[model samples]
Target: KRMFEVHVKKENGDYSTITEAIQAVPYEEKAIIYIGEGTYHEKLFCEKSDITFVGAGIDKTIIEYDDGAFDQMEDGSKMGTFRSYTAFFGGKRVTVRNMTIANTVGDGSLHGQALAVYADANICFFENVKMTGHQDTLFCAPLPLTERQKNGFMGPRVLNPRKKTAQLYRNCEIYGDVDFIFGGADAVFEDCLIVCNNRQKNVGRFINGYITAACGSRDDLGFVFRNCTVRGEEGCIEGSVFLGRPWRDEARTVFLDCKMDNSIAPERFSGWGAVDKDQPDTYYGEYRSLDIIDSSVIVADAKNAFVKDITEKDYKNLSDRADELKKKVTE
Candidate 1:
């Protein structure tokens, strides 16, 4: 494997840039690239299929950019959250390990959505990766829809109208402030650290932030975190961080067997500003959660008003709902 793999170094003979080595890869062929210890100050896009990127370490191998949501485009328009990414992935079957991808925009309340990694591919895997940003960081969305379609249109009732992308993130650290893990993909985070930075403040007091903004469709299952820890910085006040808010009406997010710090607010879910928007349809569930700040007490139902204590039987019931919907669409 080492013989055919490409080595990327800084100011050395092999390859000075990661983009250069990526461009040299053959189309639709399996390739591996080993990145050495260096802080690469550039944006990276992967369009090739079946590629694996291995780095020296998360602290040593750094890829960074400074694009924020308020930045001006060439046409004098604001660069939205979708375009503010340090590393964008559009290829299938890609693996990224032991790397730090960061967007160095300032505060989330001030600078807005500064995405570190935006992935829109299937079967993507990330291990031991650190993604840092403020708002709208680490988006794991499916392939975008056409502009002519309605904003929340699932599709014309057809067979498998929604082919959602699926991704797995394991042993990764994600740092953000508001709506950090927001997208429309079937993404699962296992044994990861969800860190909330204490940068946003109001009159010398740390303000609260929302963690996720899932926008999944009615038929899709989105944003599952299993055995993950939600923690914040030192100055963060107790009950400052929310579990998530629904970006779309039918958005879904589930947390199973996780650890929560006191930074997590008692009221787990937000309504995206309006109180009656996503309450009836949006699905948020939690089960078997341990609070690290007070281990004597397990998570109670009152701590999560909007979310439900889901059981194993509930999973089967949800699957049946999807199956019934598919049958009606086919008929």
Candidate 2:
């Protein structure tokens, strides 16, 4: 069990950046890695065990990487979620805190994607963190194939069924306009801020980009956003966003007393694609959610409303924490 610290600017014994420091830690050892203030302009990975990755500050400890989906690497692998983003963690008992993971890829056709991937080991923990990107910010429990399913909050979909990976996000911030927060896991976002920054484009395919969330199957996936705030940039309208689209049939996503602003696009939800148009089998609906803004066409799913429920405890906690979380976000 070796302990290490990495700063890209200064030279160390055998490594210069976080990427190298990660490589130095062998898969057999359970180590704790500390990162000081700096911009690690590279992708990171904790594919080992018993690792705790901590950053000094969310703004100061910046880890950024940008690429497109169609790009090819020297090894001939096309750019995808597995290759993009600042860090990718796997294995058991892994934790990451006090940092920012950003994918700089924005709206583009041929640019591929900004941030493409994240796969952490099971029973993972994320504290005081921020994941910034478009398309997909939180890619959890991605199944090796498009079939094997698992248990999660959002219900089960085609997700990464490897027990070696599961994650939890606590006291964090997430920014995007697409299915940025979509994934499959028993994970929960407790007391966080999920802001939608749609680029002021009406009919933009992804203003909220399926913001609510969706699970893979009815009994397998468990994706929940509890006592959080769903906000957006200036152009976001109330109820314009669809809660979420089902990636597969029996998908599930719930909002337990999450405070929503008028900026949430109406329709409160949308679909993943053309596959789930009339499929009664798909799990798509909104549970108990509240907001102070004007209500729009973003009505809750009236049919599947049976599975949705809002409790008094959820309401109180979210309202109490909203102000504090907003204050914590800085310029």
Candidate 3:
């Protein structure tokens, strides 16, 4: 197949901005956009499918913005948590590699929720991408079927019906403080480095951050950190971070064959404070999880080990971790 390609640079090129290149992508054909080395300060929203973004390097091809949840939008409405992303990618079979998507909102206390990348596409694939922010850095979309807070779902895609979303992050580096990885998509982080930032003060709290705030359904695979390492930033309080917390009643998050630093709390997971932690629908499953100074695991079809009565087939799907999903190939 003849692919459509566009080059982006600060100076002379097919386009001077990534947004321009993205707009040029044809609707009917697969498109590739090459972003040159430079820190791009812009807010981007992509609703296209079958598109790929190649960058000069992870540190070079930078996409950055400073919008936060409380910021004012063009429509005079507040930019909700979902709207505060540096880059939002939606549609099908979207791929991004060797680049950085960053939201420079410094803290959750002042800025509220800021997102680096919102991966809202089905079969979205990312490789060697660096996502940097303070809170809620990377969001895997298709939010919970219902809204928790009033005006919470007011951002884009909230009025529309939710869809089943799948995403894969390979060899990616994500940095944040609280609930850095959240949402309802079935996402897999393979061979990635997840860092919990120490950007905020103690503020009379022992817990400083959470790696995930998963809201995936009981039927979905949820957020799986496979062959990854979870650590803390310099001066991060010891045992101040948690593996994850439930964002919804049926939120699911698991660490598989991964490593954990002392930054992680011993208890591993926490509750969203609203949902009862003992709920049967909430599955916080893990298998062979070790100490980054050790490795995390499970048998298959998976749980915090929540659905212990999982079938062999279901276990294999979650445990073995399907190989085909390692890249962007929609089934």
lDDT of each: 0.74, 0.59, 0.80
Please state every model's RMSD to the true fold in angstroms.
6.2, 7.1, 3.6
Residue 27 of model 3 has an lDDT of 63
- Residue-wise lDDT of candidate 1 within 242-315, one digit each (tens)? 78887776778877778888787666777777432446677887766788666544655455455666778876
Clashes of 2: 51
The candidate with the higher TM-score, 1 or 2, is: 1
100-135: candidate 2 lDDT, tens digit per residue: 878776653445444533645666777898888766
Candidate 1 — worst ten consecutive residues by lDDT sum? 151-160
Q: What is the lDDT of residue 22 in candidate 2?
A: 79
Q: Is candidate 2 or candidate 3 better by TM-score?
A: 3
